[PDB]
Amino acid sequence: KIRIKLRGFDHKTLDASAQKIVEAARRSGAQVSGPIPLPTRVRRFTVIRGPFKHKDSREHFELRTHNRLVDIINPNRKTIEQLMTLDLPTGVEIEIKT
Amino acid sequence: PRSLKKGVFVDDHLLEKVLELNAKGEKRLIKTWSRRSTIVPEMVGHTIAVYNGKQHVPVYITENMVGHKLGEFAPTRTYR
Amino acid sequence: ARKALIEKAKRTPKFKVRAYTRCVRCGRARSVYRFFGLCRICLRELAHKGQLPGVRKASW
Amino acid sequence: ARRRRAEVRQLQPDLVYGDVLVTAFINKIMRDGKKNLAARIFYDACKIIQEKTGQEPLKVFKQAVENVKPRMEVRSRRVGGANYQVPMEVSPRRQQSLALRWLVQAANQRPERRAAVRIAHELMDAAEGKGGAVKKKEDVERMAEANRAYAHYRW
Amino acid sequence: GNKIHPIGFRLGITRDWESRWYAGKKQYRHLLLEDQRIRGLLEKELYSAGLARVDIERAADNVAVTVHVAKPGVVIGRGGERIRVLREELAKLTGKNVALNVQEVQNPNLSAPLVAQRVAEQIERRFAVRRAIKQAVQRVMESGAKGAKVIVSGRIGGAEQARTEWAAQGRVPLHTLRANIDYGFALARTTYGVLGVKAYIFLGEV
Amino acid sequence: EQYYGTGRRKEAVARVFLRPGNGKVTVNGQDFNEYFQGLVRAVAALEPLRAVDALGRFDAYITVRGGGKSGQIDAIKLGIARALVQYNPDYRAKLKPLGFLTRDARVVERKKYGKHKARRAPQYSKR
Amino acid sequence: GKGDRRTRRGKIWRGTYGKYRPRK
RNA sequence: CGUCGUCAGCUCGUGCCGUGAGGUGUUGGGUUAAGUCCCGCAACGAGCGCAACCCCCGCCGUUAGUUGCCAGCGGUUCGGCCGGGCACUCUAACGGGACUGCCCGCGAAAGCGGGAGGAAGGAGGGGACGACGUCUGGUCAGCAUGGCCCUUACGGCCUGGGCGACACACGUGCUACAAUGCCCACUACAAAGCGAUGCCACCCGGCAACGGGGAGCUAAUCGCAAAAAGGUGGGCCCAGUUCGGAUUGGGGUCUGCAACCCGACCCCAUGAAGCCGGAAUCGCUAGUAAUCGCGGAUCAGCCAUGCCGCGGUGAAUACG
Ligand SMILES: [K+]
Ligand SMILES: [K+]
Ligand SMILES: [K+]
Ligand SMILES: [K+]
Ligand SMILES: [K+]
Ligand SMILES: [K+]
Ligand SMILES: [Mg+2]
Ligand SMILES: [Mg+2]
Ligand SMILES: [Mg+2]
Ligand SMILES: [Mg+2]
Ligand SMILES: [Mg+2]
Ligand SMILES: [Mg+2]
Ligand SMILES: [Mg+2]
Ligand SMILES: [Mg+2]
Ligand SMILES: [Mg+2]
Ligand SMILES: [Mg+2]
Ligand SMILES: [Mg+2]
Ligand SMILES: [Mg+2]
Ligand SMILES: [Mg+2]
Ligand SMILES: [Mg+2]
Ligand SMILES: [Mg+2]
Ligand SMILES: [Mg+2]
Ligand SMILES: [Mg+2]
Ligand SMILES: [Mg+2]
Ligand SMILES: [Mg+2]
Ligand SMILES: [Mg+2]
Ligand SMILES: [Mg+2]
Ligand SMILES: [Mg+2]
Ligand SMILES: [Mg+2]
Ligand SMILES: [Mg+2]
Ligand SMILES: [Mg+2]
Ligand SMILES: [Mg+2]
Ligand SMILES: [Mg+2]
Ligand SMILES: [Mg+2]
Ligand SMILES: [Mg+2]
Ligand SMILES: [Mg+2]
Ligand SMILES: [Mg+2]
Ligand SMILES: [Zn+2]
């Protein structure tokens, strides 16, 4: 039972490298709570296109933070093997507890 | 409906300068750039020249003036 | 952004209040977003260049 | 409407009399989109048409709408020199739109202190040939026919 | 006076970001000012090498920095001393202490950032604007590409009246998302003023 | 035994479980006329039944969350219509005309810039 | 209405709380 | 970057016509939201543009269960509270589906009218996207840059004032003039967002602003939080009023070194004009207008009634 949370800006750099920390746990541990979605935290920036006046133009910019869960029931010491240090995501950050 | 709180403010440039003029007399004239300082008892009688952003105005101080800020007697804008 | 004014960077402003933000890239005072340190203009330019990670053109 | 012919909207029949015409009137009474408050009003007033009349409110309502419908109205049209008020038939749909718009209008001109009363009395007074609305309808009809001299501007 | 930056308009598809590292509302503005100071001194040095781009990746106190150039033998130095003083600028700047790489460009004539940088230099040396442009397009259009286009601003030839010279071939469907159109803007500080140079290269569709 | 059709409207989701019985409808616990009432509209949500001629045959446990009551009133119009389909599918041939099966796509249009409310544009003088 | 500082709507609109619009 | 203008356009290559500028093509008939497509044609094709490829919203399926449910069984301080389970809602990722395919009619064709099936048709609804060019358009006070000018000052630091001045005039808006209303109480349905010297549960003092204490929260797990209009009950009874909250007096809270000039906020008192606005004039074609409240950016605080967003309720009318 290890709480897992995967955050990122890319919906593939997570959704994908979130199965590596599941398959590499399907055969070395429990069944895992699979990969759990979780709502996104979209931060918007609305700015004026032109550098001077013309305040009715704007153009929008969002920076959405996607989230993932997982959760490996049964703190399998045999799963900690495949995992530990074997992945490929560069634009990701992990937060995990027991 | 004015306010300040529980710790009335006054700039110490004169807070003590003024009280010192009491330690040995009263003196004549004063020059401040703190129109933001409240007026307190020990100032009455004195004559302070507050700056109106351009000059130092001779502001005589009376009992019925305590509590007010000095700026309130040194008008900044010149009109008609 | 006059130079003698980019003096802002002063951990010693004398009074936390006088501590105003400026554009990290241009010195622009107004419209300086906090999540980027950039101003409203720079933010759009760079986002266009792709240098602002995650930052994308939002439409809905 | 430059391109099409603009089809007409269909309205969900009344949640009571199961009549569309009623909903139309309800919407004219509506204001700021408060359709609930709007609906109430027509209903309370709808009740007040009884215990004042042994007749069904709907029959009263539907016949008021009828006496307020204008069969002729005068429309403008410049013909070199100025504008000539040209009389002409009123389409079956505008008649209805006008009739209802007028009722709510006259109704709200009444002195009765509360809404439902006003719609109620205007409904009634209208049903028997009198009231603000019918007046309007007759001023209009009188306008047309008072300009028979410009009838040859058909259109 | 319109048109979305062809890159920014595609960041989602047929085009990935330069700096691709994650951060939080407290780090982000910091891990950013950095990349800028990076590309900052990075670009004022590797100029002659001809840098068509500068990627960046992070995981924690680690930074990729896959510098894309066409003349690597300029970032290497005498057998390999350049890359030394350089990775010295890295740690002395970003105390994060991180790697560094180099990626050669397979034909610096399919990377607008250069095609444009080229014309810019030619212009800065008093070349013939309408000719350079005319050629550059031909060069780009010659080594592959399904279309291309170059655009120089005004003061063309120290002219007192600013103008704008054209030139473009093949296709350059700026309105198509699945375009994949590299874009590069080259400046051009000259004696009389400044000239902007944009370059568009259409490298296949889907 | 049981029947269940979802149903949505203007961002409102309604769970509608029809179960043979009297016909007393529940909504988030409260009685039908307890979650509504005061809303001349409501009565329409149960129109699906009236059409097929149900009412006296089905009871109904309903869940409702998201948006506003008149919206919910409509999502429920689908539940009681979709669930009423699982029961007898020969009913679809009676709700098609009435359109109770049609989801209402009509939704709030995005607030655009330069404008005050998506379409309502600011006013100008020109003098 | 929304302009009356001493009313419910007055406080809602002005986004504040107080005697006339208690924080529950 | 604004602008005609999301307008249906602007061109090219070769051929053909013309001494030539140029023309044909791009004209014409049909059709379309469209130089959209069809047919015709000394033209045959092509580029920029239109459309499509992207995002959101409608229906469905797959994959996944610290968010949902007696759907379903058992416990219940009867709160999804606990066991429990992922059917449902939902969350976010992939994919399905609409093409005039499908049926009758008109048609040379494109396509037009109508129906059936379907959650949805015929561009389903809303965005991103805006050609060759125009206006010596806007910005050298965002930034960049040629020339020009100042270099004990046209540079620099600071304290204070000013940008907040007021006989007047205009624009954009806010709140209204009220009974389809205002007030008080009670009771109910939302979406999108933000939160570490941050949002602040709950508790105590205060009429209150707020102060003291303090749980939880790296935040589908806690907080901002109340949604408001609505529903129910009571009050007011047509009055410049229980309409309307300007102005002014007094007391006080709070941020900040400091609120005179010049902050917001609470409470008492005051309680203005305004009875729906001349000539004239603006927006909007559907979930739109109208109406109701909610969040955020900037930010110590705030002069936001502004701006960029969210959802509730929900019209009229378009002959032409
Ligand atoms: K306008
Ligand atoms: K109002
Ligand atoms: K034609
Ligand atoms: K569409
Ligand atoms: K010009
Ligand atoms: K009026
Ligand atoms: Mg400068
Ligand atoms: Mg400040
Ligand atoms: Mg700033
Ligand atoms: Mg020279
Ligand atoms: Mg709205
Ligand atoms: Mg009042
Ligand atoms: Mg009030
Ligand atoms: Mg404009
Ligand atoms: Mg168009
Ligand atoms: Mg010839
Ligand atoms: Mg030609
Ligand atoms: Mg030709
Ligand atoms: Mg021609
Ligand atoms: Mg022609
Ligand atoms: Mg075309
Ligand atoms: Mg499904
Ligand atoms: Mg056909
Ligand atoms: Mg035929
Ligand atoms: Mg397009
Ligand atoms: Mg000019
Ligand atoms: Mg000018
Ligand atoms: Mg000003
Ligand atoms: Mg005005
Ligand atoms: Mg208390
Ligand atoms: Mg009452
Ligand atoms: Mg009053
Ligand atoms: Mg009155
Ligand atoms: Mg207007
Ligand atoms: Mg703020
Ligand atoms: Mg103010
Ligand atoms: Mg607000
Ligand atoms: Zn800047």
- Residue with structure tokens 């049981």? F2
**The tokens of F29 are what?**
């616990």
Are the beta carbons of E110 and E145 closer than 8 angstroms? yes
- Count, in order, helices (H) and strands (E) of chain C: 1, 1
User: Which residues are E151's β-sheet partners?
Assistant: E198
C-alpha dihedral (E143, E149, E153, E157), degrees to nearest 10: 50
Residues 6+ apart with CB under 8 A from A43: A62, A63, A64, A65, C35
DSSP code at position B33: S
CA angle C1, C3, C4 (to 5 degrees): 120
- Count, in order, helices (H) and strands (E) of chain D: 6, 2
Q: E107-206 adopts what CATH topology?
A: Ribosomal protein S3 C-terminal domain (3.30.1140)
Q: Measure the CA–CA gap between E181 and E146, rounded to whole angstroms.
A: 10
CA angle A51, A53, A59 (to 5 degrees): 65
The gap from C-alpha C11 to its chain's centroid, in whole angstroms, comes to 17
CA B4 / ligand 35 centre spacing (Å): 22
Q: What is the sign, positive or negative, of the torsion defined by CA atoms of D42, D47, D50, D55?
A: positive
Identify the CATH number of the domain defined by range D1-155: 1.10.455.10
Residues 6+ apart with CB under 8 A from F33: F42
Residues 6+ apart with CB under 8 A from F69: F35, F36, F39
> β-strands F25-27, F58-65: how paired?
parallel
Are the beta carbons of E109 and E137 closer than 8 angstroms? no
CB atoms within 10 A of CB E108: 19
CA atoms within 13 A on the CB side of E15: 26
Rounded to a whole number of angstroms, the CA Rg of chain B reads 13
**The tokens of E127 are what?**
């070349």
Q: How far is CA F56 from CA E16, F19, F74, in A?
A: 62, 11, 21
User: Which residues are E86's β-sheet partners?
Assistant: none
Beta strands in D27-113 (DSSP E): 72-75, 86-89
Nearest to D136 by CA among D88, D82, D99, D111: D99
Q: Measure the CA–CA gap between A81 and A25, rounded to whole angstroms.
A: 9
**The tokens of B68 are what?**
């007010």
**The tokens of E95 are what?**
């105390």
Q: What is the 3-state secondary structure (H, E, C) of E99-163?
A: CCEEEECCCCCCCHHHHHHHHHHHHHCCCCHHHHHHHHHHHHHHCCCCEEEEEECCCCCCCCCCC
Q: Measure the CA–CA gap between E135 and D27, rounded to whole angstroms.
A: 70
Rounded to a whole number of angstroms, the CA Rg of chain G reads 7
- Residue with structure tokens 């085009």? E15
Q: How far is CA D23 from CA A1, D18, D71, D73, in A?
A: 60, 9, 23, 26
Q: Measure the CA–CA gap between A28 and D22, rounded to whole angstroms.
A: 71
Task: Answer yes or no: do A44 and C58 touch at CB < 8 A.
Answer: yes
Answer whether C10 touches E (CB < 8 Å): no
Nearest to A91 by CA among F43, E62, F107, E112: E62
Q: Measure the CA–CA gap between C60 and F110, rounded to whole angstroms.
A: 8
Return the SS3 of D127. helix
Residue to test with chain A: of F110, F111, F112, F113, most A Cβ within 10 A: F113
Q: Measure the CA–CA gap between E149 and E156, rounded to whole angstroms.
A: 17
User: Which residues are F17's β-sheet partners?
Assistant: F4, F61
- Bases on strand H under 7 Å from any protein CB: 1-3, 5, 33, 46-60, 63-66, 69-72, 88-94, 116-121, 124-139, 141-146, 155-157, 159-163, 165-167, 170-177, 179-185, 188-196, 201, 207-210, 218-220, 225-232, 237-238, 243-246, 249-261, 263-268, 271, 281-291, 293-295, 297-300, 305, 307-320
| CATH superfamily membership of B1-80 | Ribosomal protein S19/S15 (3.30.860.10)
- Ramachandran bin of F11, using left for φ above 0, alpha for ψ from -120 to 50, beta for the remaining angles: left
Question: What is the residue-wise DSSP string for chain F?
Answer: --EEE--EETTEEEEEEEEESS--EEESSSBHHHHSSS-SSGGGGGHHHHHHT-STTEEEEEEEESS-HHHHHHHHHHHHHHHHHHH-GGGHHHHHHHTTTS-B---PPP--SSSSBTTBPPP----
Residue G9 backbone dihedrals phi, psi, to 5 degrees: -55, -40
Are the beta carbons of E198 and E185 closer than 8 angstroms? yes
Set out the domains of chain C in order of their start, with CATH numbers: 1-60 (4.10.830.10)
Return the SS3 of E23. coil
CA atoms within 13 A on the CB side of A15: 9
Residues 6+ apart with CB under 8 A from A63: A9, A42, A43, A44, A45, C35, C52, C54, C55, C56
Q: Measure the CA–CA gap between A67 and E22, rounded to whole angstroms.
A: 13
Query: Long-range contacts: D134-140, Cβ < 8 Å, 24+?
Result: D134/D67, D134/D68, D135/D106, D136/D68, D136/D102, D136/D105, D136/D106, D137/D67, D137/D68, D137/D69, D137/D70, D137/D99, D137/D102, D140/D70, D140/D72, D140/D73, D140/D74
From chain C residues 18-47, the ones with a CB under 8 A of any chain A CB are: 31, 33, 35, 40-41, 43-44, 47
Neighbours of chain A (3+ CB pairs under 8 A): C, E, F
Which nucleotide does the CA of A62 lie closest to, via C1'? Answer: H55
Residue to test with chain F: of D15, D16, D22, most F Cβ within 10 A: D15
Instruction: Say which amino acid occupies A72.
Output: I
Q: What is the 3-state secondary structure (H, E, C) of A16-55?
A: CCCCHHHHCCCCCCCCCCCCCCCCCECCEEECCCCCCCCC
CB atoms within 10 A of CB F105: 8
What are the structural domain ranges in chain B? 1-80
Return the SS3 of E25. coil
Task: Answer yes or no: do E59 and A90 touch at CB < 8 A.
Answer: yes
Q: What is the largest CA-CA distance in chain F?
A: 72
Q: Measure the CA–CA gap between E187 and E170, rounded to whole angstroms.
A: 25
Q: Measure the CA–CA gap between E44 and E195, rounded to whole angstroms.
A: 19
What ligand has the least distance to the C-alpha of E163?
A: 5
Kindly give the interhelix angle for D92-107 and D57-67, rounded to the nearest 10 degrees: 110
Are the beta carbons of E64 and E56 closer than 8 angstroms? yes
Q: Measure the CA–CA gap between A14 and A10, rounded to whole angstroms.
A: 7
Task: Please give the helix or strand (H or E) that residue B56 lies within, else none.
Answer: strand B56-60
Q: Measure the CA–CA gap between A70 and A36, rounded to whole angstroms.
A: 5
**The tokens of B15 are what?**
């807070």
Instruction: Say which amino acid occupies D14.
Output: D
Task: Answer yes or no: do A45 and C31 touch at CB < 8 A.
Answer: no
Residues 6+ apart with CB under 8 A from F109: F118, F119
Q: E16-106 adopts what CATH topology?
A: GMP Synthetase; Chain A, domain 3 (3.30.300)
Q: How far is CA A12 from CA A7, A9, A22, in A?
A: 11, 9, 15
> In F, which residues are within 8 Å of D15 by CB distance?
40-41, 43-44
Task: Answer yes or no: do C51 and E9 touch at CB < 8 A.
Answer: no
Q: Measure the CA–CA gap between B29 and B59, rounded to whole angstroms.
A: 9
CA distance A2 to chain E (A): 22
Q: Measure the CA–CA gap between E165 and E170, rounded to whole angstroms.
A: 18
Answer whether E9 touches A (CB < 8 Å): no
Are the beta carbons of D27 and D43 closer than 8 angstroms? no
| CATH superfamily membership of A1-98 | Ribosomal protein S10 (3.30.70.600)
Q: Measure the CA–CA gap between D73 and D145, rounded to whole angstroms.
A: 9
Q: Measure the CA–CA gap between B28 and B16, rounded to whole angstroms.
A: 16
Q: Measure the CA–CA gap between B18 and B12, rounded to whole angstroms.
A: 9
What ligand has the least distance to the C-alpha of G10?
A: 13
Q: How far is CA E4 from CA A50, C45, E1, E174, in A?
A: 12, 11, 10, 9
Q: Measure the CA–CA gap between C45 and C52, rounded to whole angstroms.
A: 10
Residues 6+ apart with CB under 8 A from E145: E110, E170, E201, E202, E203
Residue E140 buriedness (CB in 10 A; 0-12 / 13-18 / 19+): buried
**The tokens of D36 are what?**
């609930």
CA angle D102, D104, D108 (to 5 degrees): 115
Nearest to C59 by CA among F113, F115, E12, A61: A61
Interface of F with A (CB under 8 A): 113-114
Q: Measure the CA–CA gap between E54 and E51, rounded to whole angstroms.
A: 7
- Ramachandran bin of E188, using left for φ above 0, alpha for ψ from -120 to 50, beta for the remaining angles: left
Nearest to F99 by CA among F86, F75, F85, F81: F81
Task: Answer yes or no: do C57 and E9 touch at CB < 8 A.
Answer: yes
Q: Measure the CA–CA gap between D123 and D110, rounded to whole angstroms.
A: 12
Residue to test with chain A: of E5, E21, E22, most A Cβ within 10 A: E22
Q: Measure the CA–CA gap between G2 and G11, rounded to whole angstroms.
A: 8
Q: How far is CA F97 from CA D12, D20, F92, F126, in A?
A: 14, 18, 9, 52
Task: Please give the helix or strand (H or E) that residue E168 lies within, else none.
Answer: strand E168-170
Q: Measure the CA–CA gap between D45 and D42, rounded to whole angstroms.
A: 5
Kindly provide the b/e burial profile for residues C31-54, where b requires at least 16 CB atoms within 10 angstroms of the residue's own CB: ebbeebbbbbbbbbbbbbbbbbbb
Q: Measure the CA–CA gap between A62 and B54, rounded to whole angstroms.
A: 50
Rounded to a whole number of angstroms, the CA Rg of chain E reads 18
What are the structural domain ranges in chain D? 1-155
Kindly provide the b/e burial profile for residues D121-136, where b requires at least 16 CB atoms within 10 angstroms of the residue's own CB: bbbbbbbeeebbbbeb
CA distance F15 to chain D (A): 23
**The tokens of C10 are what?**
């002063």
C-alpha dihedral (E160, E161, E164, E165), degrees to nearest 10: -60
CA angle D30, D31, D32 (to 5 degrees): 130
The gap from C-alpha E65 to its chain's centroid, in whole angstroms, comes to 15
Are the beta carbons of F15 and F63 closer than 8 angstroms? yes
Q: What is the sign, positive or negative, of the torsion defined by CA atoms of A83, A84, A87, A91?
A: positive
Rounded to a whole number of angstroms, the CA Rg of chain D reads 18
Q: Measure the CA–CA gap between E120 and E126, rounded to whole angstroms.
A: 10
Residues 6+ apart with CB under 8 A from G24: none
Is C42 a known ligand-binding residue?
Answer: yes
Is C51 a known ligand-binding residue?
Answer: no
